[PDB]
Amino acid sequence: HFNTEDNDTDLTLLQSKIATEEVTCDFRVSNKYMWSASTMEYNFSDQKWTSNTEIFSTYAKTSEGFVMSGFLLNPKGQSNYNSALREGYLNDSAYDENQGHYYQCVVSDEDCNNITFMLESNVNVFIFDNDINLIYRSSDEAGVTSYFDRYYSTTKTIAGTSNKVISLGLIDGNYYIVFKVKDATATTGYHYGYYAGQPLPIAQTTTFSDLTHYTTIKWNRSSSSQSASTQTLTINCPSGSEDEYALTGVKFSDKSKAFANNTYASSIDYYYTPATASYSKKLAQTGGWWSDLVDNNPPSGSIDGNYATSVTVHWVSGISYVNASCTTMTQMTLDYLVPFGIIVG
Numbered sequence: 207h208f209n210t211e212d213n214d215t216d217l218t219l220l221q222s223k224i225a226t227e228e229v230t231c232d233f234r235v236s237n238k239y240m241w242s243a244s245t246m247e248y249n250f251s252d253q254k255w256t257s258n259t260e261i262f263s264t265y266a267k268t269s270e271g272f273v274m275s276g277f278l279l280n281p282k283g284q285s286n287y288n289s290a291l292r293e294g295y296l297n298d299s300a301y302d303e304n305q306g307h308y309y310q311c312v313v314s315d316e317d318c319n320n321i322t323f324m325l326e327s328n329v330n331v332f333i334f335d336n337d338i339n340l341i342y343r344s345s346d347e348a349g350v351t352s353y354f355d356r357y358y359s360t361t362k363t364i365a366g367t368s369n370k371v372i373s374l375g376l377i378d379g380n381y382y383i384v385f386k387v388k389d390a391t392a393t394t395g396y397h398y399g400y401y402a403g404q405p406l407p408i409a410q411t412t413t414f415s416d417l418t419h420y421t422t423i424k425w426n427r428s429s430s431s432q433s434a435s436t437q438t439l440t441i442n443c444p445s446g447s448e449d450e451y452a453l454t455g456v457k458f459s460d461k462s463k464a465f466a467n468n469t470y471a472s473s474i475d476y477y478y479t480p481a482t483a484s485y486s487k488k489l490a491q492t493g494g495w496w497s498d499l500v501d502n503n504p505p506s507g508s509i510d511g512n513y514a515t516s517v518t519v520h521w522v523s524g525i526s527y528v529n530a531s532c533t534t535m536t537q538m539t540l541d542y543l544v545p546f547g548i549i550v551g
């Protein structure tokens with residue numbers, strides 16, 4: 207028997223804490239979740255719930271009568287989120303049998319020890335250990351701290367309704383998750399959703415004010431093309447969290463329109479070396495002159511490291527002006543995924 211009702215002595219009120227993390231700039235580390243340019247980001251504003259009241263009864267049960275948790279592992283598409291989610295309505299036909307929705311959660315890796323809950327107003331969740339002893343209750347967010355690696359709690363609007371959003375990390379072991387109603391006479395708030403395995407990948411963006419690809423190239427009066435190695439930016443993550451940041455994209459905003467380089471150059475090529483590799487890459491021009499210069503598929507790993515830059519000016523055919531020059535300059539933006547409940551809340 208799963209005793210949710212009776213209070214425990216080993217329960218202490220938990221404190222919601224997330225690290226205050228800042229991405230620094232100054233003028234290789236792989237990601238622990240395998241996140242990359244192909245991973246699908248998680249958006250609370252996109253999360254949909256099934257209108258099917260009996261959704262919980264569609265889940266297969268173990269020989270012991272539990273529903274096994276989903277396992278979020280580097281989602282590359284919607285189908286991956288659909289199968290990793292466990293959701294239900296506590297006013298369904300299945301609720302009265304054992305007075306709750308009973309799940310099993312297995313944690314074997316510290317990097318896949320996450321549980322993220324999304325509870326509507328009439329839902330309470332309880333977590334039991336392998337001996338069926340209560341180690342967590344969401345009602346007042348109390349638990350046995352020795353089982354927790356981390357704890358975070360907030361509120362998000364999911365499918366037009368306010369949800370209690372909880373993200374926690376457990377030590378390795380076998381666990382049971384039970385969902386019970388707050389008030390059996392409530393008119394609404396009977397839905398719950400949850401994800402186990404990896405934390406949710408959250409898309410983040412950061413633009414640096416330090417100028418990249420910034421140089422004045424003066425025509426050498428003989429060659430048809432001239433190159434110059436430009437600024438290298440060192441991007442730093444707070445110590446020991448380098449592996450939490452996962453680089454998904456690089457964009458360079460061209461800031462040189464006012465120098466009208468088109469008057470003496472046929473084109474300008476822009477290159478960069480991402481933090482996640484040692485080789486140079488030609489940046490793709492999204493449009494014409496002064497359009498964004500992108501790497502939509504950078505090598506996977508941490509945003510931490512050095513970003514080198516270089517440019518190649520191709521002079522116009524018929525170039526004859528002695529003091530002809532090009533002044534180039536871009537500002538860098540990085541697109542990356544970070545874990546919900548660890549880096550962002």
Ligand SMILES: [Cl-]
Nearest residue numbers: 242243244503
């Ligand atoms: Cl990829």
